Design an enzyme around this catalytic site. Structure first.
Site, mmCIF file in Angstrom:
data_model
loop_
_atom_site.group_PDB
_atom_site.id
_atom_site.type_symbol
_atom_site.label_atom_id
_atom_site.label_comp_id
_atom_site.label_asym_id
_atom_site.label_seq_id
_atom_site.Cartn_x
_atom_site.Cartn_y
_atom_site.Cartn_z
ATOM 1 N N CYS A 71 45.647 41.825 35.106
ATOM 2 C CA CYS A 71 47.046 42.428 34.501
ATOM 3 C C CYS A 71 48.135 41.438 34.908
ATOM 4 O O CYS A 71 48.194 40.732 35.835
ATOM 5 C CB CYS A 71 47.266 43.825 35.026
ATOM 6 S SG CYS A 71 46.010 44.814 34.412
ATOM 7 N N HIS A 108 53.115 49.392 35.515
ATOM 8 C CA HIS A 108 52.224 50.334 36.395
ATOM 9 C C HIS A 108 51.656 49.527 37.656
ATOM 10 O O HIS A 108 50.839 50.193 38.055
ATOM 11 C CB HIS A 108 51.103 50.610 35.304
ATOM 12 C CG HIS A 108 50.213 49.469 35.125
ATOM 13 N ND1 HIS A 108 49.494 48.718 36.021
ATOM 14 C CD2 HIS A 108 49.722 48.610 33.833
ATOM 15 C CE1 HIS A 108 48.669 47.893 35.560
ATOM 16 N NE2 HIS A 108 48.785 47.740 34.032
ATOM 17 N N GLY A 152 42.673 42.277 38.943
ATOM 18 C CA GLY A 152 43.906 41.095 39.323
ATOM 19 C C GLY A 152 44.159 40.504 37.963
ATOM 20 O O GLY A 152 44.969 39.648 38.151
HETATM 21 C C1 LIG Z 1 44.833 45.185 35.617
HETATM 22 N N1 LIG Z 1 45.247 44.698 36.902
HETATM 23 N N2 LIG Z 1 43.730 45.957 35.314
HETATM 24 C C2 LIG Z 1 42.744 46.011 36.384
HETATM 25 C C3 LIG Z 1 41.447 46.218 35.582
HETATM 26 C C4 LIG Z 1 40.750 45.267 34.838
HETATM 27 C C5 LIG Z 1 39.635 45.417 34.196
HETATM 28 C C6 LIG Z 1 39.006 46.580 34.100
HETATM 29 C C7 LIG Z 1 39.668 47.755 34.881
HETATM 30 CL CL1 LIG Z 1 38.997 49.201 34.530
HETATM 31 C C8 LIG Z 1 40.780 47.717 35.516
HETATM 32 F F1 LIG Z 1 41.413 48.557 36.026
HETATM 33 N N3 LIG Z 1 44.021 47.093 34.444
HETATM 34 C C9 LIG Z 1 43.462 46.780 33.099
HETATM 35 C C10 LIG Z 1 44.565 48.144 35.002
HETATM 36 O O1 LIG Z 1 45.244 48.170 36.041
HETATM 37 C C11 LIG Z 1 44.710 49.335 34.060
HETATM 38 C C12 LIG Z 1 45.992 50.242 34.459
HETATM 39 C C13 LIG Z 1 46.092 51.294 33.336
HETATM 40 C C14 LIG Z 1 45.201 52.469 33.652
HETATM 41 C C15 LIG Z 1 45.231 53.495 32.633
HETATM 42 C C16 LIG Z 1 46.143 53.543 31.509
HETATM 43 C C17 LIG Z 1 46.908 52.484 31.531
HETATM 44 C C18 LIG Z 1 46.708 51.096 32.332
HETATM 45 N N4 LIG Z 1 43.461 49.886 33.937
HETATM 46 C C19 LIG Z 1 42.774 50.449 33.036
HETATM 47 O O2 LIG Z 1 43.401 50.063 31.916
HETATM 48 O O3 LIG Z 1 41.789 51.084 33.098
HETATM 49 C C20 LIG Z 1 40.782 51.497 32.074
HETATM 50 C C21 LIG Z 1 41.316 52.869 31.631
HETATM 51 C C22 LIG Z 1 42.335 52.828 30.469
HETATM 52 C C23 LIG Z 1 42.589 54.222 30.184
HETATM 53 C C24 LIG Z 1 42.104 55.265 30.401
HETATM 54 C C25 LIG Z 1 41.311 55.186 31.648
HETATM 55 C C26 LIG Z 1 40.822 53.927 32.241
#
Ligand SMILES: *C(=N)N(Cc1cccc(Cl)c1F)N(C)C(=O)[C@H](Cc1ccccc1)NC(=O)OCc1ccccc1
Ligand SMILES: *C(=N)N(Cc1cccc(Cl)c1F)N(C)C(=O)[C@H](Cc1ccccc1)NC(=O)OCc1ccccc1
Lengths: 305, 305
Positions: free
Chosen positions: A145, A41, A143
């Site tokens: 991930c 992603h 940052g």
């Molecule tokens: C990684 N670089 N990272 C960034 C990050 C770190 C801490 C909290 C959040 Cl909210 C955040 F975005 N992540 C975890 C992500 O980039 C993921 C990407 C993603 C998004 C949606 C589905 C799968 C993967 N962001 C994430 O998980 O955001 C929370 C989320 C999950 C599911 C549905 C809505 C929001």
């Protein structure tokens, strides 16, 4: 002598962490031999995530969109493929620091060390467990991930986790280093939630053994119990069923302390029913389930690397 | 996003840990440049310890009695001196992996990472705090003496602790890398005990801020309070007095969360008086005092190395 939640030394893994940027997104990658592994992603924009067709999105990717950085050095991309939910970015430069390593898919209830990174620079190291619901309770900010979890089995780094996701419930989901998520999770921005998080009963007992070995013994009772009887109290408190295999695993701990496993189950039964009444075991007011029997024996002996 | 007790990456320190044997005793040493630092009680026999005259005991020491081992390689000893409670074993081979480093004597209430070793091979890494009574709560088995605690300040490894002692109370005592014990402890097998272990109030508040930043907010009250008033409740519960300097240190956390420090003190006052009533903050049923304001800001931002 002491009992603490400790991670493996992360030296062998530090020199494997790089920075990956695609467009406006930057996260961490894992550079072993001539390949950089990272979450796929990284190619999606905050908007693509709502419904990504990663194969098509990947067609639109030139190596030029993939800027990989090892600290300050910049690496060359001579190909880019997708294995499940991870990108395999081939580079020309083999990592001169690639350790002996395997990719292992760990089982629910097992523990690993996480090396948290931000923009390809390691930030810290801590121990996690793969919960029964295939989540982990870690510390992953923006940052983060691409950070990996790992165990050091003898001379080999066993990579078992790469961080992808935070659930809106505040727990963390990710994949093995082959790109298969742990649990039913998908890398799409949609409604998904962790199932019921049960407690890892075999681990709690290993922790109670660790406590006995460290002088904390106020919980040892005269009562005893049978597997079937104890598993009734366990089910009641969303504890994992204790199998006979779990009792065999606690063998060496039973032997060291002189306390039959089922006798320890008798103690746990009373703690679940009555509570701690304001005492503490190894410094916790709660029952800890993120130590395996092997984490305990390892710390109560002196295994090194 | 998560909040966990995490250690610094230990890569820079791993390649500094050697094995030291004197007679029948084997423990860990720290090899920086051409010097191996280790606890001077490596030269004592279990019997010498009752009343060691280390200077005389050291006269009877030939370099030949000091067998230093870097993993499997064996190092040459071209001198041996004593600085307070540490031996400085000069060797001919400078460590090709000596990192940029300082020796710092940390203050009570500050935290460091411990790289636990057994026989010169690192075993794991965990975070400790220097308690107000100059002890630490760690995990040190036999063979663990000589393990060091450290912080990574920018590009420099700041060594601040070397393990020497377990108190018969189950806590751990040691020295800075100049050989001066933290606290009133002596490396002699005699009756010594840790003083009253008070709680690090400034840290508990940084932890409560870390909790607010991570969605745990059931403890935030409408009450407020003054420094003098709050410090009465603190003294009552063996909490450290909160100074104005401590409030200035919590400035950046107050700013990030929008909660005046004294308002957070109002919340802590009620938690001390009434308890948690079975809730949990960041997963603990107890108040945590081994995170500094700087550990928190570091984890709630993304500082790397
Ligand atoms: C990684 N670089 N990272 C960034 C990050 C770190 C801490 C909290 C959040 Cl909210 C955040 F975005 N992540 C975890 C992500 O980039 C993921 C990407 C993603 C998004 C949606 C589905 C799968 C993967 N962001 C994430 O998980 O955001 C929370 C989320 C999950 C599911 C549905 C809505 C929001
Ligand atoms: C270090 N190699 N190490 C061995 C060790 C590890 C865990 C527990 C114990 Cl009991 C243990 F011996 N240590 C901590 C020691 O070698 C010290 C050496 C020592 C002995 C006496 C005074 C100062 C230093 N052993 C130790 O602390 O034993 C506990 C103790 C302390 C004070 C008085 C009596 C016993």
């Amino acid at each position: 002598s002491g009992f603490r939640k400790m991670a493996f030394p992360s030296g062998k893994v530090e020199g494997c962490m790089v920075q990956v940027t695609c467009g406006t997104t930057t996260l961490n990658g894992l550079w072993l031999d001539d390949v950089v592994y990272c979450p796929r992603h990284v190619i999606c924009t905050s908007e693509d995530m709502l419904n990504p067709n990663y194969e098509d999105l990947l067609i639109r990717k030139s190596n030029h969109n993939f800027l990989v950085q090892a600290g300050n050095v910049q690496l060359r991309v001579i190909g880019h493929s997708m294995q499940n939910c991870v990108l395999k970015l081939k580079v020309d430069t083999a990592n001169p620091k690639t350790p002996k390593y395997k990719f292992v898919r760990i089982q629910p209830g097992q523990t690993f060390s996480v090396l948290a990174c931000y923009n390809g620079s390691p930030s810290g190291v801590y121990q996690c467990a793969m919960r029964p619901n295939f989540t982990i309770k870690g510390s992953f900010l923006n940052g983060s991930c691409g950070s990996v979890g790992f165990n050091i089995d003898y001379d080999c780094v066993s990579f078992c986790y790469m961080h992808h996701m935070e659930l809106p419930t505040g727990v963390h989901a990710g994949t093995d280093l082959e790109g298969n998520f742990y649990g039913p999770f998908v890398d799409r921005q949609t409604a998904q939630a962790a199932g019921t998080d049960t407690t890892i009963t075999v681990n709690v007992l290993a922790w109670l053994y660790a406590a006995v070995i460290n002088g904390d013994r106020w919980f040892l009772n005269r009562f005893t119990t049978t597997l079937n009887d104890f598993n009734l109290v366990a089910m009641k408190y969303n504890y994992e069923p204790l199998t006979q295999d779990h009792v065999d695993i606690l063998g060496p701990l039973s032997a060291q302390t002189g306390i039959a496993v089922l006798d320890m189950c008798a103690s746990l039964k009373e703690l679940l029913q009555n509570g701690m009444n304001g005492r503490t075991i190894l410094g916790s007011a709660l029952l800890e389930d993120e130590f395996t029997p092997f984490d305990v024996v390892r710390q109560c002996s002196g295994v090194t690397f």
